[PDB]
Amino acid sequence: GTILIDLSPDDKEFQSVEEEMQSTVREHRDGGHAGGIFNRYNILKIQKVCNKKLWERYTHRRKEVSEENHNHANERMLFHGSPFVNAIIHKGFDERHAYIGGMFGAGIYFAENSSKSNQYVYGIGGGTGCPVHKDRSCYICHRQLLFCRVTLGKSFLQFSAM
Amino acid sequence: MAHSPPGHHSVTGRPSVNGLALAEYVIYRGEQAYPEYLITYQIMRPE
Ligand SMILES: O=C(NCc1ccc(-c2nc3ccccc3c(=O)[nH]2)cc1)OCc1ccccc1
Numbered sequence: 538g539t540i541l542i543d544l545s546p547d548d549k550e551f552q553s554v555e556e557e558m559q560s561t562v563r564e565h566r567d568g569g570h571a572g573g574i575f576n577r578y579n580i581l582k583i584q585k586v587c588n589k590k591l592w593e594r595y596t597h598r599r600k601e602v603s604e605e606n607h608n609h610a611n612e613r614m615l616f617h618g619s620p621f622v623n624a625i626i627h628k629g630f631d632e633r634h635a636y637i638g639g640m641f642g643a644g645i646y647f648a649e650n651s652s653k654s655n656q657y658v659y660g661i662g663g664g665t666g667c668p669v670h671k672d673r674s675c676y677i678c679h680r681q682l683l684f685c686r687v688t689l690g691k692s693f694l695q696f697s698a699m
Numbered sequence: 700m701a702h703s704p705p706g707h708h709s710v711t712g713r714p715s716v717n718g719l720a721l722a723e724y725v726i727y728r729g730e731q732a733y734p735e736y737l738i739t740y741q742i743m744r745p746e
């Protein structure tokens with residue numbers, strides 16, 4: 538049921554998402570080991586994900602959560618990086634997309650830093666890198682990330698030591 | 700997949716040491732996220 542619609546680099550919607558990617562790059566404590574050494578991305582394509590059934594599943598849960606939180610969904614736009622990006626756009630998120638050993642428990646993780654999500658694109662800790670060169674810092678191979686609509690509702694605030 | 704903390708729908712993981720590091724978020728239901736945009740990119744080598 539999923540179709541992908543390309544956005545034009547001349548479209549404001551494209552420029553906004555690119556701006557969100559580029560401005561949320563930061564330095565990482567690992568000096569680039571997991572995600573590579575870069576300050577900016579070369580954006581190759583941005584696509585809208587349209588899927589009626591996945592959308593309705595999302596908005597139905599949003600409504601429950603919103604009502605449980607006194608008419609406040611607490612909805613955000615956040616990055617997600619994963620080796621399973623292709624399965625996610627066709628099937629949606631589920632428990633096999635969870636990070637079992639994550640610091641805040643076993644759930645689906647999302648980031649405000651685009652470069653945080655970039656660290657997971659080839660796997661935990663960047664796996665073994667791009668499939669072709671086995672290079673976590675590959676400047677050649679194409680990477681993919683999602684920018685996702687996320688309902689937080691009543692979010693439990695946990696400070697980390699990072 | 701764990702349940703979210705009692706009375707809560709998600710976790711906000713907020714770095715307390717790196718002041719330049721932004722938040723991370725966890726949900727425990729797949730139906731609480733929709734993958735709106737697919738971004739295809741390369742990282743760029745610094746000059
Ligand atoms: O099991 C995984 N990945 C599950 C997973 C997916 C996304 C994330 C993820 N974690 C984050 C943590 C903090 C902030 C952001 C993120 C994020 O965007 N994604 C974590 C784990 O990788 C192993 C692997 C490696 C190579 C091939 C197949 C599988």
Ligand SMILES: [Zn+2]
Pocket residue numbers: 667668669670671672675676677678
């Ligand atoms: Zn490569």
